[PDB]
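Q: What changes when chloride ion is included in the input?
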Amino acid sequence: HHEPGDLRHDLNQQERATLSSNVQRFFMIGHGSLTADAGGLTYTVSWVPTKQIQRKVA
Amino acid sequence: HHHEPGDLRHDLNQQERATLSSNVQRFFMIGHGSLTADAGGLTYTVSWVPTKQIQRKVA
Amino acid sequence: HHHEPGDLRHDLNQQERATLSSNVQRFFMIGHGSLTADAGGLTYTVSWVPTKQIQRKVA
Amino acid sequence: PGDLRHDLNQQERATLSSNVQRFFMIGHGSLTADAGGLTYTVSWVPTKQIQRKVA
Ligand SMILES: [Cl-]
Ligand code: NA
Ligand code: NA
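A: The predicted holo structure follows.
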């Protein structure tokens, strides 16, 4: 799988999996923005993650 | 009692929503989209063409 | 286990998609299309007329 | 072009051509058609080394 040079580059699997879950949950409970264009869909959401992760990415 | 936003999720059924949430989760895990440090926190953004059944509805 | 977008790729067979992926990798290496910055990250976009066979499937 | 590839070296540009190629196959991005022909677009964050350069 692709290894992007964004904030996931500094997180371990557990931490990345915690964040993947955050995003999936937010999508289900109505948070963020799902929009469509010519291309397809874009989902965007912002949040403050748990402190353990927040210290690492903030 | 979850918020029900008026974005594209407004046009989609529960199954369609659950499928897309799965796309978003997996995309996060497989390194797609962009995870940046925003003002106070994180922003995750990802773009994709959904599977055919959903594509029919959104296109 | 890959994502199966409902875009034109939905309508193409494995070999036609293989060929197009090659067309795209080639175009990138020879200066075609446009590689630009943000969205957070990179966007690459390229337009082209594919072979007559693929052409008929996609129009 | 005088886009980002202008400033990227051969290893970097090859890496990205491989990203683009793999993303096409794994279903990421958007393949659409016009009266023209086909358009493929995909966005992504490259490996740190390249992301550090283009951001
Ligand atoms: Cl948000
Ligand atoms: Na896609
Ligand atoms: Na086109």
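Observations recorded in class: The pocket of chloride ion (ligand 1) is lined by residues A 31-32, 45-46 (CB under 6 Å).
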